[PDB]
């Protein structure tokens, strides 16, 4: 027997962390510096470009934080890429770029900066700058919100960054975190970054498993054999994604059905029910004891 840490006394003094901190979703340290505007700007909305890579999806939002909770202007999802040719492979560095490029041109569609600020139409891989044009409405500036992702070189958060950067979003960044950054002598080969965007890192692995054993390739790439994506299709397949994304960037929402309005969810057991159960349990016990003895 030792002194229990979690007494009555424990939870009296105990101060819970913020709800998103308890759920492990937000770094309130990193949020505070991203999101707050200089007080001499006054309601000038500070845009942060939110990239969240999931297990099965890449969620690329643009947000500006008001006092009721932040208002999302434009949301770009990787599950929208099968409208542009990318059937499967929704969660790779190439799909990250396509989701970022989809966010860029969809926002610029709504603001009427569609024809102005094209950017990199042919994907080079270089450090591109979305320069403002004198006389036109200034380039849309937002900041890359990475979340709780360890920002190493070749993190897919920087795929959706470069995706948005080439689409005509004026985001500050360095090429240090793009894949192709020679860390050993501090250079950036833009050709390696071109492989990753056009998906030759995945293509060579399909080619690597193509030869050694057929049984393991069917296990790894089970849906690239289903959805008929060969490694030779790959580079020209993302160009058919990039072409159609830049052509028709607008989102069409799914129309709501006349639903049953049924209940999947057990409702809150009300007082008179809960006050009855303790009356029934006590009655249930003392009758079993008289029947016994």
């Amino acid at each position: 027997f030792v002194k229990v840490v979690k007494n009555k006394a424990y939870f009296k003094r105990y101060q819970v962390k913020f709800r998103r901190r308890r759920e492990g979703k937000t770094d309130y340290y990193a949020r505070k510096r991203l999101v707050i505007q200089d007080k001499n700007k006054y309601n000038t909305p500070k845009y942060r470009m939110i990239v969240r890579v999931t297990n099965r999806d890449i969620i690329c939002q643009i947000a500006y934080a008001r006092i009721e909770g932040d208002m999302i202007v434009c949301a770009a999802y990787a599950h929208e890429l099968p409208k542009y040719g990318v059937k499967v492979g929704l969660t790779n560095y190439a799909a990250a770029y396509c989701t970022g490029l989809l966010l860029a041109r969809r926002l610029l569609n709504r603001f009427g900066m569609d024809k102005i600020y094209e950017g990199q139409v042919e994907v080079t891989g270089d450090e591109y700058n979305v320069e403002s044009i004198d006389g036109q409405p200034g380039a849309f500036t937002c900041y890359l919100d990475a979340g709780l992702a360890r920002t190493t070189t070749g993190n897919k958060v920087f795929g959706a960054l470069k995706g948005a950067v080439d689409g005509g979003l004026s985001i500050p960044h360095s090429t240090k975190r793009f894949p192709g950054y020679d860390s050993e002598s501090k250079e950036f080969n833009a050709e390696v970054h071109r492989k990753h965007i056009m998906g030759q890192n995945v293509a060579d692995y399909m080619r690597y498993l193509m030869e050694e054993d057929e049984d393991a390739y069917k296990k790894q790439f089970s849906q690239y054999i289903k959805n008929n994506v060969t490694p030779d299709m790959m580079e020209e397949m993302y160009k058919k994604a990039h072409a159609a994304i830049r052509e028709n960037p607008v989102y069409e929402k799914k129309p709501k059905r006349e639903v049953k309005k049924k209940r999947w969810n057990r409702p809150k057991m009300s007082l008179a029910q809960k006050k009855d159960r303790v009356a029934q349990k006590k009655a249930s016990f003392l009758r079993a004891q008289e029947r016994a003895a």
Binding site: E23, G24, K25, L148, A149, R150
Partner: protein
């Protein structure tokens, strides 16, 4: 049917040789774990100075080694063999892990070397379960829930099912 996501498996086999010594007796005990596992074992610096023991603040006391997956199952097969496939009731932790020791490393599959010497070392089987890697992430972490945990009662019947290990009291 029981759920195939309650598949109680080995996460890691935590080895270390704590010699209470730096320099020559320690750096040749580093070669022992690398002949045993086939990976470069991490040296362990001291917590603080205990003058009775012959340790000192930031002195290398021990050399530890974590083995995962395909190798750990085979080394824990080598090591239980030294303990003729039997462990005791006290040897299993209440958190649902178990460990033991071996007095000399010659019984593992390394021949006696005159120059290098003899080193007894620690086996600690960190038993886990799919969904135990929730609790050590950077993203959305969380405790693993009460039903999903490995108990002392559960680790003993696992070792008895897997290695036919005759568990005896005391």
């Amino acid at each position: 049917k029981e759920n195939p996501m309650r598949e109680l498996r080995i996460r890691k086999l935590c080895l270390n040789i704590c010699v209470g010594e730096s320099g020559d007796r320690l750096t040749r005990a580093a070669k022992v774990l690398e002949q045993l596992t086939g990976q470069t074992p991490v040296f362990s610096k001291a917590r603080y100075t205990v003058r009775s023991f012959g340790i000192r603040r930031n002195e290398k006391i021990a050399v530890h080694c974590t083995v995962r997956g395909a190798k750990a199952e085979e080394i824990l097969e080598k090591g239980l063999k030294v303990r003729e496939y039997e462990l005791r009731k006290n040897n299993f932790s209440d958190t649902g892990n178990f460990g033991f020791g071996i007095q000399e490393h010659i019984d593992l599959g390394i021949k006696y070397d005159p120059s290098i010497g003899i080193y007894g070392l620690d086996f600690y089987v960190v038993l886990g379960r799919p969904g135990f890697s929730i609790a050590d992430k950077k993203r959305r972490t969380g405790c693993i829930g009460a039903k999903h945990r490995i108990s002392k009662e559960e680790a003993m019947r696992w070792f008895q099912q897997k290695y036919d290990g005759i568990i005896l009291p005391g």
